[PDB]
Design a binder for these strands. Structure first.
Lengths: 84, 203, 165, 121, 109, 50
RNA sequence: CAGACCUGAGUGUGGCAGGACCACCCGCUAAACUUAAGCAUAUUACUCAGCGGAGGAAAAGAAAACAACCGUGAUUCUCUCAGUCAGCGGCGAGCGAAGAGGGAUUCAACUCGUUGCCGAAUCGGGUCUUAUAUGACCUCGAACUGUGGCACCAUUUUUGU
RNA sequence: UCAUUGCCCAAUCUUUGAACGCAAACGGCGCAUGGGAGAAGCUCUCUCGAGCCAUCCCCGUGCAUGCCACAUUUCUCAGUGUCG
């Protein structure tokens, strides 16, 4: 109960916290340079639900076909209005 | 479209010619292990028309399932019971063999989605169905916006929920209203409906 | 001593070997027969020599050319300035179907070694129906080779040049 | 030309074509902890009467140490940490939950002295 | 809001004598007024097929229904782009927004 | 018996530390409903068993 | 004269899967108690239990429907009909529905395989550009056929070729 | 700059665990690789000393299984399938 030591250890938490923060992000950077892979381990690459990790990436999902596309061009439907 | 030939040709099951084809297949399976990947169907015509369209992600399986019917398994074949559901080969088996088959494929791996499957052969023993299975992970496939529907949450299996047309057959789907009836909201749902309780707001 | 006639195998070996044998064993219909009377060592080969004249090639030639047409033609106010169509064999299952159906390849060359033979089974018959020339030709592989694919499926000539006729 | 020769009527596979994989950038761990260490190894000294006696007689310190510790590790640590060498260690963990190390400090050192280097009483 | 649909006399004996604005439309009618169905769908007028269209009367009535909506058309254009396409009309004219609408107004039951 | 695995070694240890009067200093505070060291294990009554 | 191809191995390489959870779902499967004053049919119940297996809901869903009209127009769901003149049923016990109408909700609808699709697959994977496609190039998945076009409502049927 | 305040993005997270190197009433035991530490040795002869480095120990992380794609434009094979 020269109680002050708790804090000091808690200070220890603080360097330590920081430290990895830095390292970790260090790492992250030097992973890239390709759109993918190994850039950056999973533990650098942050969990996000089974489903959330699953999912259709937008390109492949919005990048539908010519048939439709032409069609889409052909049948837009924005505003009309009626009453009289 | 060559399939037009192919198909008809394919209708000729009951003949010698076929039976050659069949026979080789009937030694081949008969020689062979239970479930196998294929580098292509043995019945492309159905496959392509049940939808196979030549690229990755499309996976082929041939599958062997014992035919026959079944016993009601009971230890030592004894039922206490009132008479009714009796007999060793009693209750006949509502689910279809194809469906089981697919389903067993469904169980068989930790991936595949039955796109569909067709019978290819049967013998005195085994039914063979050639199963069109898909993985929903290929980046091209995933890329594929036509099929990508396949990817989704409802597709954490399918076949055991009864999703093939055939499965759907035992699942009973016909739109012929007075031969469509009950199963139309499943078996059950409709039961729940039909035997509802007195929910009357007012009275 | 050596064990092969007194070995055992994996089944896959077993299978194929056994498969040939069983394939000899049963009485095969004439319909099942109609592969077997294949062209001769010479003849089949000779044809390949020609076939190579009519073979198909790299994506490039058309592209390289496209690049031509585009550059010249499509820009310049001159139209249809390209060279000529290449002269290769007509191939490809579906294609040949129409071909046949349009009675338009002269001669059809039918492979007797193909993954469903069923896929092609109707063809000699068909040929016969279309009263066209049809050959029972060996192997997929060489065919593959004139087209540079691992094997190749069905084959016909619509044309060539008269010189070769 | 030329077929194999065979050592059993039946077939085999041959062990071969193995040569590098080396899957993963692996070793994941950032900024490595290196597991355990000294201010944590030795937790608070043990100091009973028995310590008092032991200190004297084999030149020995009783310390409460990290119970997971294998002997070795402890040995490395202290020697370096305390500028010493130890003739021998008996350890046990009591369900007290702690590993107690009975350490005879060598003649090059005196556990009591050394005690009051720590400033141990 | 409401999307134009036809008017029908509709079922039974018990209904033999009755009319309801039914599902869908009648491509034939729509045709008869003239209108690309696809386009019609874009306008928000239903379509159908399984209306097999049993008798004459229906057209007649319907073209007028159709027409009437159209009479009461606004159609919004796009600016820069020319109002033109259908000859989409007058920016201030409505007020398109809010009174959603019930189609019954443009062509009644 | 004579010998009795580390896990086992753990179970007593963990318990023992609980088997004694609740930390009194705690008790003293404001609003301390605190009846007693409830859950304390004992042996001539309460073998831990197994 | 000469060495493939083809298939099945084994690596390497990148994913995936498991088990959770499991109120509701979706499948699957599947009692007896009960009642009938007995009881076997029946009933319970196509319920319990069991099992598989999903989701945020699921399920369903676009005509081999309904009809018998002066007609109707995906599904769902609701109300309704009708506990019925539909009716099943020791025909008893006990059971037993649909269609329409009103109505909610909805501008909901959709593809491929059999049609000439075709001047080195129009593709895809990889690569590399471009800051993505695209460009580009291989790979080599792919001419056992992916593209595009067309998809028995059309296209104008048909004939105005 | 209070707050065991509040919130929370930021992170940590043993030992487990479907639980997966192997294993299991054992903190057992491995296997590849990295990394650490050090009597002795060695070396520097630095006088000491120091270093350097070995026997020795530890830690990190791979390494379970299935399935799936793939490999330089090819990875290595097999086969009485099969080419002349």
């Amino acid at each position: 109960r020269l109680g002050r030591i708790r804090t000091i250890r808690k200070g220890i938490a603080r360097i330590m916290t920081v430290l990895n923060k830095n390292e970790r992000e260090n790492l992250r950077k030097f992973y890239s340079d390709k759109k993918l892979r190994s850039a950056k381990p999973k533990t650098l690459r942050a969990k996000l639900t089974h489903r959330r990790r699953l999912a259709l990436k937008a390109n492949e999902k919005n990048r539908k076909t010519r048939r439709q596309l032409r069609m889409a061009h052909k049948f837009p439907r924005r505003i009309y209005a009626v009453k009289v | 479209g060559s399939f037009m030939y192919l198909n008809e040709l394919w209708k000729k099951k009951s003949s010698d010619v076929m039976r050659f084809i069949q026979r080789v297949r009937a030694w081949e399976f008969r020689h062979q292990h239970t479930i196998v990947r294929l580098r292509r169907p043995t019945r492309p015509e159905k496959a392509r028309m049940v939808g196979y369209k030549t690229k990755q992600g499309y996976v082929v399986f041939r599958v062997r399932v014992r035919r026959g019917g079944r016993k009601r398994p009971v230890h030592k074949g004894i039922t206490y019971g009132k008479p009714n559901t009796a007999g060793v080969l009693g209750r006949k088996l509502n689910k279809n063999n194809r469906v089981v088959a697919e389903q067993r494929l469904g169980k068989k791996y930790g991936n595949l989605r039955v796109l569909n499957s067709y019978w290819v052969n049967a013998d005195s023993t085994f039914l063979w169905y050639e199963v069109v299975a898909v993985d929903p992970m290929h980046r091209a496939i995933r890329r594929d916006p036509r099929i990508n529907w396949i990817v989704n949450a409802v597709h954490k299996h399918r076949e055991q929920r009864g999703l093939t047309s055939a499965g759907r057959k035992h699942r009973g789907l016909r739109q012929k209203g007075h031969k469509a009836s009950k199963l139309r909201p499943s078996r059950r749902a409709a039961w729940r409906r039909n035997n509802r309780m007195v929910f009357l707001r007012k009275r | 001593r050596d064990l092969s006639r007194f070995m055992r195998w994996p089944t896959f070996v077993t299978m194929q070997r056994k498969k040939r044998v069983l394939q000899r064993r049963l009485k095969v219909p004439p319909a099942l027969n109609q592969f077997t009377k294949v062209l001769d060592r010479s003849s089949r080969n000779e044809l390949l020599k020609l076939v190579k004249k009519y073979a198909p090639e790299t994506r490039k030639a058309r592209r390289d050319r496209l690049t031509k047409v585009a550059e010249e033609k499509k820009k310049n106010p001159k139209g249809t300035v390209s060279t000529k169509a290449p002269l290769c064999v007509v191939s490809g299952l579906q294609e040949v179907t129409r071909t046949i159906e349009k009675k338009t390849a002269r001669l059809v060359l039918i492979a007797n070694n193909v993954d469903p033979i069923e896929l092609v089974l109707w063809m000699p018959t068909l040929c016969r129906a279309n009263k066209i020339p049809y050959a029972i030709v060996k192997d997929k592989a060489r065919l593959g080779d004139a087209i540079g694919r691992k094997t190749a499926t069905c084959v016909a000539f619509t044309d060539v040049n008269a010189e070769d006729q | 030309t030329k077929r194999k020769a065979y050592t059993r009527p039946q077939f085999r596979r041959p062990h071969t074509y193995r040569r590098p994989a080396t899957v993963k950038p692996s070793s994941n761990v950032s900024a490595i902890k290196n597991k355990w260490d000294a201010f944590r190894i030795i937790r608070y000294p043990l100091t009973t009467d028995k310590a008092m006696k032991k200190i004297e007689e084999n030149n020995t310190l009783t310390f409460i140490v990290d119970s997971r510790a294998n002997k070795t590790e402890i040995k490395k640590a202290i020697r370096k940490l305390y500028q010493v060498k130890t003739v021998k260690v008996n350890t046990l963990i009591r369900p007290d939950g702690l590993k107690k190390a009975y350490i005879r400090l060598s003649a090059s050192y005196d556990a009591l002295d050394t005690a009051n280097k720590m400033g141990l009483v | 809001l409401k999307a134009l649909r036809p008017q029908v006399n509709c079922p039974t004996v018990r209904y033999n004598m009755k009319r309801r604005l039914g599902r869908g439309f009648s491509l034939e009618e729509l045709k008869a007024a003239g209108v690309k169905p696809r386009y019609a769908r874009t306008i928000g007028i239903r379509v159908d097929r399984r209306r097999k269209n049993k008798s004459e009367e229906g057209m007649n009535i319907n073209v007028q229904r159709l027409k009437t909506y159209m009479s009461k058309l606004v159609l919004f254009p796009l600016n820069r782009k020319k109002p033109q396409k259908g000859d989409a009309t007058e920016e201030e004219v409505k007020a398109a927004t809010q009174d959603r609408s019930r189609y019954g107004t443009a062509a009644v039951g | 018996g004579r010998f009795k695995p580390l896990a086992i070694k753990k179970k007593y240890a963990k318990k023992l530390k609980q088997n004694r009067p609740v930390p009194y200093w705690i008790r003293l505070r404001t609003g301390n409903r605190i009846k007693w060291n409830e859950k304390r294990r004992h042996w001539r009554r309460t073998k831990l068993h197994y």
